Amino acid sequence: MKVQYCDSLVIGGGLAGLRAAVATQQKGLSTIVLSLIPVKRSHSAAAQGGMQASLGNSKMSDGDNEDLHFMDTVKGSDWGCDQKVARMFVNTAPKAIRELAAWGVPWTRIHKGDRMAIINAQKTTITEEDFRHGLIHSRDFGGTKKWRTCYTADATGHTMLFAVANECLKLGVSIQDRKEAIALIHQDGKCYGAVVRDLVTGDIIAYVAKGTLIATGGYGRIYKNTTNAVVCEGTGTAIALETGIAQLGNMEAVQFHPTPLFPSGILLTEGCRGDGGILRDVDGHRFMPDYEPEKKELASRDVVSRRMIEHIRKGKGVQSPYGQHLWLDISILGRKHIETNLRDVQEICEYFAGIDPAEKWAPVLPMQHYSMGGIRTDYRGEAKLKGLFSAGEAACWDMHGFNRLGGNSVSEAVVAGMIVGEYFAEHCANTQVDLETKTLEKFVKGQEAYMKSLVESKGTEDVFKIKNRMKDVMDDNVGIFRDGPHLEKAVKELEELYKKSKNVGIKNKRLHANPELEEAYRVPMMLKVALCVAKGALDRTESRGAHNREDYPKRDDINWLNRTLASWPNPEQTLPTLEYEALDVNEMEIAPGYRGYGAKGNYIENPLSVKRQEEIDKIQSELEAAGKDRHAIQEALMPYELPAKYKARNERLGD
Amino acid sequence: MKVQYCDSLVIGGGLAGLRAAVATQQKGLSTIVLSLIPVKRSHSAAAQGGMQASL
Amino acid sequence: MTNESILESYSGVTPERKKSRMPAKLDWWQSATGLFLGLFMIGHMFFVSTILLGDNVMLWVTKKFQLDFIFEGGKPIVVSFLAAFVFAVFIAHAFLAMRKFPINYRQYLTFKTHKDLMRHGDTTLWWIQAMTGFAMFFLGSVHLYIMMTQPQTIGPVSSSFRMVSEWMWPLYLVLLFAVELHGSVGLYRLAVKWGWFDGETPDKTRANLKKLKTLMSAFLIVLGLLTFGAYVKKGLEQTDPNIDYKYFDYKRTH
Amino acid sequence: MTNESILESYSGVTPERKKSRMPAKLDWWQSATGLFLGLFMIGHMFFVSTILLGDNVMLWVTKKFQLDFIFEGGKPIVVSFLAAFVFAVFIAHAFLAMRKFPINYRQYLTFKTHKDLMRHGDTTLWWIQAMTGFAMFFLGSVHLYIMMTQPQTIGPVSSSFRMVSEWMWPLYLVLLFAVELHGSVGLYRLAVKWGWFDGETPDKTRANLKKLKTLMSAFLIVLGLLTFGAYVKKGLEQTDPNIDYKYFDYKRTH
Amino acid sequence: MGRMLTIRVFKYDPQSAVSKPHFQEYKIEEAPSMTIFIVLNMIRETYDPDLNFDFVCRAGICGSCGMMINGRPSLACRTLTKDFEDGVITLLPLPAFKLIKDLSVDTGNWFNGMSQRVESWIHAQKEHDISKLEERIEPEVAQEVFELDRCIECGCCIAACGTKIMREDFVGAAGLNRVVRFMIDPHDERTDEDYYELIGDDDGVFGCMTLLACHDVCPKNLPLQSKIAYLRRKMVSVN
């Protein structure tokens, strides 16, 4: 038997998974980092827009602060997130972005002088003072009433992933690409590590360690049309669910992006609009402050996208041999504001769309892009399976709720990595474990058998036909607009397939560097993660954030101010066991109301919502008359907990 | 902390220590073999007379 | 050997613990000595292409090389010193540039295949430098030794002699193209290696340096062949059995 | 390139999955071509050392090389074919034996130091082979080309001419020792490399092959110098300005 | 669109004693806007599922999918069939990289290794308070310190470097480039002789024979041409 130990494993060398491993390895903990493909090729690299931090340097980031970011985030969450987490976060992003910039990351910085902004209408000539020259700059982004989205051109995610990964290499972390986690190791509801299958040699190894973190990124690939890389299949989400002890949260909360270059699905940044570029209809105008006057563009995903399907369902979808769609005209947004800072989102258009960006509008169309849900964990990172932590799009720490805010995911990545890191190092350095050879063997010898059955399998299902059929079901019925009948013909076929996925037959017998065998043990997992979303969504009868239910269009606060905690307790069962967890209004620093946009007055209101509001304004006004700063009041309304290292307040420009 | 596991350790790559590791490794047991100096330089090499066997 | 020779060899670092600077001093002279020959070869293409201007004009320059206006009417041993010298900077270059050679079945087979699959201009022009470079190991040696042993046999008549009566045209014809390709590219590759011209658009510079290379060496390939056919004709018309043309003396010899 | 060229390059094994045999076919010709030149150089040391036997005896052999007893009284273009040939097996050897060369600052510095510390006979004699081998890149080329362009200028008088009147003695003196050390050792190292003589006590064979090497090449170094001083003297005593000695014709020329 | 395509692919499995270096022709009908990512994929889902190859972003920014397409290293996911004249397309795995199977090679760990070799990371002496403010940089400095942090570690300029294919310890363009990216970054306090110790040997910058094959094939269009030259000009005058 092959076994390898380390003080702290880290399943997923993404952007978040790496930051975490940095905060552990830097303090004696010998750590490992498994990964399908070499780290610097993760999906983070493909980050366009930027990182959002309540910084406040730019003439626009000006006057920004935790509170504003806090609110911007929370209101965007359509109130389905954990307020004290969103709080920990905001107070860390700033000092997170600074660390990065000090590690190399070249953030496009401010220059003394007058700019040439485009705003909504047109050119407005902005002027940055001179006490701002050389400080991290910002961009206007989706749903922000302040410019706090930082950037390094439009390939921001890239310069970050590298700056971090490079750091691990400096510390002696151990990267081990082409190695996949296929099952976690638990004994008495405790995680001892994982069972890994060397994608190349093909042999199973047991990776044991005191702690174990899972950062396997989104699951956008359970859908046919997604912007996510082809290795964002949620296998990692799947294996924590297969332990039947931990639970996935809001698995049905899937965010969709408005302008992914159709049909490839290759992203085309929001900096398009935040930089002034705007959406042209089929008639070719602005269904912009036409459908929603506070700008259609510069509104949340679930918003800006919704109507993008309305105009089309009214038959106004000017298709092609693949489908109806719209266009994004940034032709009028200068050839300097395009040939730079929308540099990729221009080459992307020439090499694929075979046309020019500073020329025309693109054949776009909303598709899946982010995955809020995932392994549900508490505020410190740990889950229900004590010992197993999580962070990144991969899990549901939930500072997102039912609608992530543009430029937050890759801020949550480093932030969460910093926070959940300190709490992971703590656990591994203290918790003592009882490693049992009988158990280790049970899991390993048990996984090996699994591989064999698959090879000696005699069933006759084309995993590629079952796989592709799943992605069809999802993208169709669980699209932007969901309804009772369709989230049933789905929850049904998705099940009928998890049953067919056990009768598959592969042609290539080899037990090594076999790609076919990979898609055989990978699919069944995806389906189980698919059932969690489809069924998870079917049950949740109302319309909140990215969850639009044509038949329960009102954001029910009285019944659905909870989180769909999906589990899979028994090995046999074909459908997830959805239990719900309620939210406490008397812990919210901001009570349930209108989100600043979206359709007005469409939420069946809850009584405690108001009551809490009153006593918020009570406390508010009293401590303002008393002469208390915003931190004192924050502390009043709702206190949040943070680790030592990241306690101090973020010093801003002009105090 | 640095820890390394194996199904069966073998402290001493002498002449005996090695034979043993052969009968274990030949049956699936992942084994290791620690040693002050590379094995073929053990003290066994310096054997003069011979091996006695009721042949 | 020295003690710091042993030490740098047994550890791979200077006694003061630093990577020998040698490899830099060496990568400098390979280019250094290379540039020299590169220009002498353009100058030599003119000091010699004067035979297309009367036997007299050419006969003139051959003398001045002998410092006639200082040492009598001519001094041949002075040319043996230019050859003996430009023969030393010939060897030095070879010895330092043959390090950059393919050398064992693999490095050769692999490089080749790649060259053909790729079909990359600049990568293919190197090969040529590495090819011609070998060739000149044999050809160039003859010629260089001569201008060092018979510095008097150089004139408008005596030089024509050597050309056909001793048979150098079979050689001067081959070598004429080698020394002109290896010289041409060598300089272009030398300008981009250290990039003295890069500038603010080094992408456009490498563009002209690449085309300019051509014209400049296409002009020297024609002019060079004209200067060739000149001593050949002049060499054919020499049938008087009663004359030593090789030593066709005028005053301080010929 | 072929498809099995690409394949053998991208995988490092023949399409039938085996290590190319090439490296063996190549290690055979390096020794092969090397042995050839090794002997031609002993034979050439005799076909040429006949000048210590009257200008007549020597003048004789120079003719027969020209197949006088078949083609008139002499045929020079036939020698140009022996040179043109032994000039090809000259190049081939260099090209295949220069692979065995030190080549980059390190391989050189390291080997050197070692050579001096060790002070090992046979390891030191290699160096010499690798030294002289380079040298002959320049020297040997001149001489070989000539016996291919002026095959008539070879006789007891005309050859003496070249020696001093064209100045080859500065060269024939250097090259005389190279071609005799590189040849000598080369053969000794060739006999032990493939060991055709090993036998039942290959330790005593390598013992004689090592001493025999000496006498055999000490004899060829003296006899070679005698044959040298011969054309030199014969070359000094040629002051008649009214004679072309280079072409000192007798019948079918000279 | 509708025309027939001939796909020549390389195949060999270094771990199967019975596999032999061979080719395989597949025949795919063209589609409009068909990138090799599609073609090579159909071949898997439908025709032959034995074929190994690595894809990740599919957008052209992860650097995975790099291979010898008709003799030239380039990104598969961003290469179109349309641009292939006659219609024959031969696929070979990047040379100069530890082979794994057919078209899959180890691009990763060489880079995760060269990175280490050139000590690829900000070499500051002291940390700044992530709490306090940030280090002010000219917006134009952080500009160029960008164009060189863009390298996506794809392998193409290592696959094209005839040098690295012969001598194999060479640092490669992608390596020399990195070194510069850190010279010119303010936050990094490394001197020139510090860099000479990393790449001042015949395996470093000096082993580069300015073939300029890297500079011409970089899928991201960097200035390897001049930059590698710039590096040279300094390291050669060092000490």
Ligand SMILES: *Cc1cc2c(cc1C)nc1c(=O)[nH]c(=O)nc-1n2C[C@H](O)[C@H](O)[C@H](O)COP(=O)(O)OP(=O)(O)OC[C@H]1O[C@@H](n2cnc3c(N)ncnc32)[C@H](O)[C@@H]1O
């Ligand atoms: C797809 C996408 C996402 C995206 C974006 C554009 C596109 C096309 N633009 C963004 C933007 O402008 N601003 C932003 O804030 N976010 C943007 N995003 C999403 C964002 O990058 C992600 O949410 C974030 O990077 C997610 O965190 P993380 O970095 O950890 O995860 P990842 O990049 O998805 O990588 C997953 C890693 O885990 C390894 N893995 C996966 N499964 C396994 C198993 N089973 N075993 C072992 N390792 C595993 C992957 O290989 C990878 O390294």
Ligand SMILES: *Cc1cc2c(cc1C)nc1c(=O)[nH]c(=O)nc-1n2C[C@H](O)[C@H](O)[C@H](O)COP(=O)(O)OP(=O)(O)OC[C@H]1O[C@@H](n2cnc3c(N)ncnc32)[C@H](O)[C@@H]1O
């Ligand atoms: C000393 C001697 C012994 C000997 C002999 C002549 C001499 C000079 N002639 C013999 C003979 O003719 N016939 C015969 O039967 N025996 C003869 N012997 C003795 C015989 O060789 C030994 O009794 C026998 O070899 C002992 O068994 P073993 O092979 O295991 O042990 P070893 O050779 O002594 O080697 C010890 C190995 O253990 C490693 N080691 C030791 N301490 C450690 C620690 N702390 N940690 C890790 N490794 C350790 C040694 O390095 C070695 O490999």
Ligand code: HEM
């Ligand atoms: C017969 C001996 C010669 C040999 C063995 C030889 C070999 C080489 C080789 C292989 C290179 C190095 C390519 C590189 O590493 O980038 C080169 C370059 C060059 N050689 Fe030669 N060469 C010879 C003679 C000459 C002559 C006679 C000239 C005169 C025109 C010349 C001019 C050049 C130039 C200009 C370069 C550029 C050097 C550089 O890249 O720094 N070479 N030579």
Ligand code: HEM
């Ligand atoms: C100091 C030494 C040198 C001198 C003074 C010299 C002189 C001459 C002269 C006068 C000729 C005419 C033919 C003859 O008289 O034999 C000639 C031709 C030639 N030389 Fe040189 N040379 C020198 C060095 C070189 C070198 C190093 C090269 C390059 C490898 C070279 C390449 C050639 C070639 C190919 C021709 C043919 C010219 C043509 O037909 O266009 N020379 N040289």
Ligand code: HEM
């Ligand atoms: C100028 C071109 C020449 C070069 C570059 C050269 C180079 C070499 C080198 C370096 C070796 C190989 C040592 C080894 O690997 O064991 C060698 C061996 C030898 N060479 Fe030459 N050589 C040259 C000319 C000659 C000539 C003219 C002779 C004629 C006497 C000769 C006879 C030999 C012999 C007998 C060997 C033994 C080959 C063997 O070890 O298989 N070489 N030469």
Ligand code: HEM
């Ligand atoms: C087929 C071509 C060859 C022929 C027919 C030939 C002919 C001659 C002749 C007749 C001489 C006398 C001087 C003269 O007339 O210039 C001579 C001398 C000499 N040859 Fe050759 N040779 C040939 C090949 C070689 C080769 C390949 C080498 C070895 C590299 C060589 C090395 C020498 C040396 C050093 C001398 C001086 C002899 C002494 O003074 O002892 N020859 N050769």
Ligand SMILES: CCCCCCCCCCCCO[C@@H]1O[C@H](CO)[C@@H](O[C@H]2O[C@H](CO)[C@@H](O)[C@H](O)[C@H]2O)[C@H](O)[C@H]1O
């Ligand atoms: C550009 C030359 C570089 C300087 C010289 C030293 C480095 C290059 C040579 C070293 C590698 C040896 O290379 C090996 O040589 C032999 C020559 O007998 C070649 O042999 C092949 O080409 C030669 C020449 O066209 C043919 O006569 C021969 O029939 C053919 O089989 C091998 O295909 C080559 O791989």
Ligand SMILES: CCCCCCCCCCCCO[C@@H]1O[C@H](CO)[C@@H](O[C@H]2O[C@H](CO)[C@@H](O)[C@H](O)[C@H]2O)[C@H](O)[C@H]1O
């Ligand atoms: C035996 C020669 C083998 C064939 C030729 C190719 C392989 C050997 C050379 C390649 C390695 C380069 O080797 C390097 O050359 C330079 C010459 O400028 C030497 O330089 C040293 O010796 C030369 C020659 O005596 C001196 O003029 C010089 O002042 C001195 O510093 C270096 O000490 C040597 O390490």
Ligand code: SF4
């Ligand atoms: S430097 Fe250029 S060719 Fe090399 S890995 Fe980076 S992007 Fe690719």
Ligand code: F3S
């Ligand atoms: S192509 Fe290769 S040889 Fe050097 S100049 Fe660029 S890295």
Ligand code: FES
């Ligand atoms: S497939 Fe990701 S960059 Fe090509």
Ligand code: NA
């Ligand atoms: Na999430």
